[PDB]
Amino acid sequence: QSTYSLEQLADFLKVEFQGNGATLLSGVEEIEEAKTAHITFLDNEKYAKHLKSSEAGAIIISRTQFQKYRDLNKNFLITSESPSLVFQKCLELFITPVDSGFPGIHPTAVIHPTAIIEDHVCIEPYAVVCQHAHVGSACHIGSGSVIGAYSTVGEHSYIHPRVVIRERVSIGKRVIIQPGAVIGSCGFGYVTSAFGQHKHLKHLGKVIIEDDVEIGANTTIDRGRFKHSVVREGSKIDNLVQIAHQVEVGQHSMIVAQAGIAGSTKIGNHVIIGGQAGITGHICIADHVIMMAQTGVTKSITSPGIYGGAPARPYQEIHRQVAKVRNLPRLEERIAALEKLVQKLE
Amino acid sequence: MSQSTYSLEQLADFLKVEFQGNGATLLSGVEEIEEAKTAHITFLDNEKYAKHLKSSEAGAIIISRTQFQKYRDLNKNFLITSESPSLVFQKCLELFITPVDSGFPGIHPTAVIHPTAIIEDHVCIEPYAVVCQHAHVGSACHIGSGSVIGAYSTVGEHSYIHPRVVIRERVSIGKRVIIQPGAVIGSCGFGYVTSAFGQHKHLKHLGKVIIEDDVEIGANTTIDRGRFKHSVVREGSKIDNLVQIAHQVEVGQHSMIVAQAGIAGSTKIGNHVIIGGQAGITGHICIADHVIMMAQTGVTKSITSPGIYGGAPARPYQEIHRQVAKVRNLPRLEERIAALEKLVQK
Amino acid sequence: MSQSTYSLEQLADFLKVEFQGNGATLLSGVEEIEEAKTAHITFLDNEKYAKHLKSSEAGAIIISRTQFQKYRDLNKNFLITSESPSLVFQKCLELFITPVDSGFPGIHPTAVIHPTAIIEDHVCIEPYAVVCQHAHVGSACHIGSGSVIGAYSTVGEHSYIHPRVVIRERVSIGKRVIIQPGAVIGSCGFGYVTSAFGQHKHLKHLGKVIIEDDVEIGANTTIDRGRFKHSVVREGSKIDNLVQIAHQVEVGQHSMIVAQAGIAGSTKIGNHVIIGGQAGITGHICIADHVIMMAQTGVTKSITSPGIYGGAPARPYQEIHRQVAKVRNLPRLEERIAALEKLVQ
Numbered sequence A: 001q002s003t004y005s006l007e008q009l010a011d012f013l014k015v016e017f018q019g020n021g022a023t024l025l026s027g028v029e030e031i032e033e034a035k036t037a038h039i040t041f042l043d044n045e046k047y048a049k050h051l052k053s054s055e056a057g058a059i060i061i062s063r064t065q066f067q068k069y070r071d072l073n074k075n076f077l078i079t080s081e082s083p084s085l086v087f088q089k090c091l092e093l094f095i096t097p098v099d100s101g102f103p104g105i106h107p108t109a110v111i112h113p114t115a116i117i118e119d120h121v122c123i124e125p126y127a128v129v130c131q132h133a134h135v136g137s138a139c140h141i142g143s144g145s146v147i148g149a150y151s152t153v154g155e156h157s158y159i160h161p162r163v164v165i166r167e168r169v170s171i172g173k174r175v176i177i178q179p180g181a182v183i184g185s186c187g188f189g190y191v192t193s194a195f196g197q198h199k200h201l202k203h204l205g206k207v208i209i210e211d212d213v214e215i216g217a218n219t220t221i222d223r224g225r226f227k228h229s230v231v232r233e234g235s236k237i238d239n240l241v242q243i244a245h246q247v248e249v250g251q252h253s254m255i256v257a258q259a260g261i262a263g264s265t266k267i268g269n270h271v272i273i274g275g276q277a278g279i280t281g282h283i284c285i286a287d288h289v290i291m292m293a294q295t296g297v298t299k300s301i302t303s304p305g306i307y308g309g310a311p312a313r314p315y316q317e318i319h320r321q322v323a324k325v326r327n328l329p330r331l332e333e334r335i336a337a338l339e340k341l342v343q344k345l346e
Numbered sequence B: 001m002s003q004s005t006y007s008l009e010q011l012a013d014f015l016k017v018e019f020q021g022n023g024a025t026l027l028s029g030v031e032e033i034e035e036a037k038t039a040h041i042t043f044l045d046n047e048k049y050a051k052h053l054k055s056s057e058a059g060a061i062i063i064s065r066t067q068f069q070k071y072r073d074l075n076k077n078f079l080i081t082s083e084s085p086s087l088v089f090q091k092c093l094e095l096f097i098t099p100v101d102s103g104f105p106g107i108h109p110t111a112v113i114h115p116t117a118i119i120e121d122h123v124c125i126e127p128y129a130v131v132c133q134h135a136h137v138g139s140a141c142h143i144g145s146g147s148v149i150g151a152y153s154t155v156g157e158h159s160y161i162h163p164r165v166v167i168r169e170r171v172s173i174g175k176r177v178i179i180q181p182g183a184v185i186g187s188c189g190f191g192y193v194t195s196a197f198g199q200h201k202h203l204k205h206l207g208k209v210i211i212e213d214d215v216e217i218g219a220n221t222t223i224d225r226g227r228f229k230h231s232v233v234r235e236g237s238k239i240d241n242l243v244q245i246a247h248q249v250e251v252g253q254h255s256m257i258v259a260q261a262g263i264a265g266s267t268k269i270g271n272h273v274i275i276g277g278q279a280g281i282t283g284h285i286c287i288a289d290h291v292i293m294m295a296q297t298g299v300t301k302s303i304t305s306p307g308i309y310g311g312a313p314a315r316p317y318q319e320i321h322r323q324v325a326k327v328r329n330l331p332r333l334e335e336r337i338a339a340l341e342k343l344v345q346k
Numbered sequence C: 001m002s003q004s005t006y007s008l009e010q011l012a013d014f015l016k017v018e019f020q021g022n023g024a025t026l027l028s029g030v031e032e033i034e035e036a037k038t039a040h041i042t043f044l045d046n047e048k049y050a051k052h053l054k055s056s057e058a059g060a061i062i063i064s065r066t067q068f069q070k071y072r073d074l075n076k077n078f079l080i081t082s083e084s085p086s087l088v089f090q091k092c093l094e095l096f097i098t099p100v101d102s103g104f105p106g107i108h109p110t111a112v113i114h115p116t117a118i119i120e121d122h123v124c125i126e127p128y129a130v131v132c133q134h135a136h137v138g139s140a141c142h143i144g145s146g147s148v149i150g151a152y153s154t155v156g157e158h159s160y161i162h163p164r165v166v167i168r169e170r171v172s173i174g175k176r177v178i179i180q181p182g183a184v185i186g187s188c189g190f191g192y193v194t195s196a197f198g199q200h201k202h203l204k205h206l207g208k209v210i211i212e213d214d215v216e217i218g219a220n221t222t223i224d225r226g227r228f229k230h231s232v233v234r235e236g237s238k239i240d241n242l243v244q245i246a247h248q249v250e251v252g253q254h255s256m257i258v259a260q261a262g263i264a265g266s267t268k269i270g271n272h273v274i275i276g277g278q279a280g281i282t283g284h285i286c287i288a289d290h291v292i293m294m295a296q297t298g299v300t301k302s303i304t305s306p307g308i309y310g311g312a313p314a315r316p317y318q319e320i321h322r323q324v325a326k327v328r329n330l331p332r333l334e335e336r337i338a339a340l341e342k343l344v345q
């Protein structure tokens, strides 16, 4: 650990500063809690209401937000870039990451003869690499994880401990899979028999995880019966998420924790799926669609914008619906007020 | 380019299935009925496709006898089966993508098996799996890499346990059972003794989890053991991924619980029940035979009669359809009062 | 093994408890109060179950002194206790069904322990568990098979970790803590900066996860680490299966989170709070001490006073209960508007 002054911090960040440049800083903290020795940031408007009174010895602020608060006696770090990224730079100054302590390929790691392991890879204890698997260069295979038969882990990916990647899975470049996640599990499909009974079907389709994808903890992705399941590049998936068989997740999308997409559904590019939300099967989510948390998308969405509720309706339309449902006592009163002036006899 | 090429007749004889049309027709893959080309094999599956069979350019269509008789006059290559068209199709599919194992045959040396545990003939135990005291693994079983077969736990013949499954102590697994990676079977139930004003004290659960024949359990699904009673999944039932089965829950025969749904404690589910994805079911209630819950259903009382159910709380489909409608048509109902209120005379 | 039968009297002595009914009454197991036959011991702890008491053919009923006084006139075999009837029932439960361990005592040959890690006394580490650099295993801990104790992470005394648990790096586990199988403690939190292109950049999370004393965590539950600050779960709190705890979430003392519930980033849950199954609580909000949230609740804003809440969005029990009732009433309501328009002549 070390200390940086406000002027000394500015040059390292390549950021213009305003205020008392001798302010000494020894850590990092959020805007609502930071002490004089702490550094902070502001990127949003529904956050700026806490800036007026903040002890922080350094505040990272954009050129836009700086305009509304520049006169205030606070110490500033004014940047034309995202205040959040500039803030991470400051975070990575103070805390250092730590690995397991088992570098390279651990003697325990069982690797199948026919598997191809590239140069500069780390395989932690008790990991199992199956037949004809291809672990790329500069990859990390976490402790106890499983790389399935004929599966490919593209270069620079990071598999965390105890992860099951099943047979025939394409993992892209620099993909990060959190611990406990399962890729290429069987899709929930059965033969609906005549006595009402359910007969298993071996799903054999590929699961393709493209470059720059992130998969959260214990998230499960199902493979199709014989066609592909795809999570297109730059998409970020959170914890405990369900991706059904033959789902296509479009590029640079986000699926928040505990959300679920049902079988054979196309999610478009730059789509946000809120937490605990549920999108049903055989439907299409248009590009740039934002779901609220706990949304039931039952029909296909065919235009961008903010959606929410069960079923899915535009934000404007549910925000009005909720505030009109809340209005039902008052509306009934107006009926009682009207059923009072029906004492009309003559 | 595909794996293999068959004639219509050659393939028909391989399947032990009658054919109609050009027996010489070359067939080199499979496809969905509405996409299949000449080289492709497909199946008509009783549901739709009346007009979509007529205009199908497939080189082979797997059809039931009852349905071939109806489409007898059509100019198509038919593979007529007495079994399920889809089930036959599976065999066909498996000729073009042959299913693959991890490439570790037999019982791997790195498998820890308790001296007391009994392992039957022709079983396969993959690397790093653990078989605890007095466990009983039936013949033709598969224990996936680094899975745990708990103390006094039994696994019926021909059952397939995938990698990193935990089967706790005192859990009974039927024959032909398939468990996807990372399921937890026999975890403690969420029940406690309250004491010292709201403080919760651990209760040891000593009930069993009884999984019956031909049952499937999805990936990272968790099934809790009872306090003293048992948690039972009856014959042929299919539980998807990320499902939660609480302590002392009973699921009847040939029932389906889709991904991310949860049943609370001491609740009985009937036979031929479909529990929609993400749906929730309260504890100490009953779900009758042949009940179907839509996704995200919140069941708060018992359901005694069959049919389709939706909403939170759950009500018979038609009712919640009628509700969403009326709720949506609230502004129209308000203008119906507002303009009616405008009539204010004498 | 245990076709074990005890007399009502024998049991009463072991229980150190007052009784009513024939001493010789032979009891050979436990059963729930609705179903209990003459062979069986059962308990009445919950007042919703006082119904099944009147017609009970049970061989023995564990009961509080107050409930006995109330149902005194009944001719049933009573075991009368001043403690929790459920706890006393637990003592019987264990007499018939003895618990069991894996059968691999102490530190198993096949465990991997990084030389720099510290292992205390009377600790059990099961087959193929991995303990990473500079970890600390408290005295009399249980590490389940194939469990990972990540770097610089510490596990307190008498803590019980079940098989295939991932404790990621820099995670503090308190004393007595029990973690069910498949749990992930200390995964990276969900945080990205979206570029003026639509592309999402990975923000590295360096914060800890602090699990306090007597905390329990359910199967396949995931608790994320903060970006800089910590995610804390305080004393006594019990978390169920399949639960999401986002980065920088603080959970209070003696709080309960039922299965499949979720808490978004940087939210503080107070003490003695119940979060119903599958409930969802947004980020950057606070939940007051002594708050119950019904299952499937969608909490979109801070709850600042104690009570029972429900629905999506969340409103206090009273109001939501009315709201649902009035939505139920809609068809009847507009029929009154129809008869209103009927008279216009």
Ligand SMILES: CC(=O)N[C@H]1[C@@H](OP(=O)(O)OP(=O)(O)OC[C@H]2O[C@@H](n3ccc(=O)[nH]c3=O)[C@H](O)[C@@H]2O)O[C@H](CO)[C@@H](O)[C@@H]1O
Pocket: B190, B191, B192, B227, B229, B248, B265, B266, B283, B284, C031, C032, C033, C034, C042, C043, C044, C045, C046, C047, C048, C049
């Ligand atoms: C979440 C859960 O799992 N159970 C809740 C349920 O408890 P509940 O009283 O239903 O008991 P639990 O469901 O917790 O325990 C399971 C077994 O206890 C048996 N039993 C319970 C009480 C009794 O006096 N006699 C008896 O035999 C039930 O028949 C059942 O078979 O509602 C109570 C509040 O109303 C809560 O305290 C519990 O957290």
Ligand SMILES: CC(=O)N[C@H]1[C@@H](OP(=O)(O)OP(=O)(O)OC[C@H]2O[C@@H](n3ccc(=O)[nH]c3=O)[C@H](O)[C@@H]2O)O[C@H](CO)[C@@H](O)[C@@H]1O
Pocket: A029, A030, A031, A032, A040, A041, A042, A043, A044, A047, A084, C190, C191, C192, C193, C227, C247, C248, C264, C265, C266, C282, C283, C284
């Ligand atoms: C509730 C929720 O879903 N939050 C997420 C959301 O909110 P948001 O964009 O606000 O990010 P967060 O604020 O949650 O980031 C984590 C920390 O940043 C602090 N903070 C935030 C804004 C600000 O102007 N100054 C400040 O100091 C917060 O107090 C918090 O402790 O998108 C972020 C990506 O950018 C994620 O990292 C957040 O976790």
Ligand SMILES: CCCCCCCCCCCCCCCC(=O)O
Pocket: A188, A242, A243, A244, A245, A260, A261, A262, A263, A277, A278, A279, A280, A281, B240, B258, B259, B260, B274, B276, B277, B278, B292, B293, B294, B295, B296
């Ligand atoms: C007759 C079944 C009920 C119909 C509604 C169920 C489909 C909606 C699913 C909600 C989203 C959850 C995604 C999980 C589905 C899956 O993995 O199979």
Ligand SMILES: CCCCCCCCCCCCCCCC(=O)O
Pocket: B190, B244, B245, B246, B247, B262, B263, B264, B265, B279, B280, B281, B282, B283, B298, B299, B300, C240, C258, C259, C260, C276, C277, C278, C293, C294, C295, C296
């Ligand atoms: C507090 C009661 C609210 C009403 C409940 C209706 C919605 C059902 C949701 C049940 C959650 C299912 C998860 C299993 C719970 C458990 O493990 O005990």
Ligand SMILES: CCCCCCCCCCCCCCCC(=O)O
Pocket: A238, A256, A257, A258, A275, A276, A293, A294, A295, A308, A309, A310, C190, C244, C245, C246, C247, C262, C263, C264, C265, C279, C280, C281, C282, C283, C297, C298, C299, C300, C312, C313
């Ligand atoms: C009709 C629905 C309205 C209710 C929506 C509010 C519910 C909020 C749910 C958010 C909790 C999800 C937890 C995910 C954790 C994470 O973000 O990483």
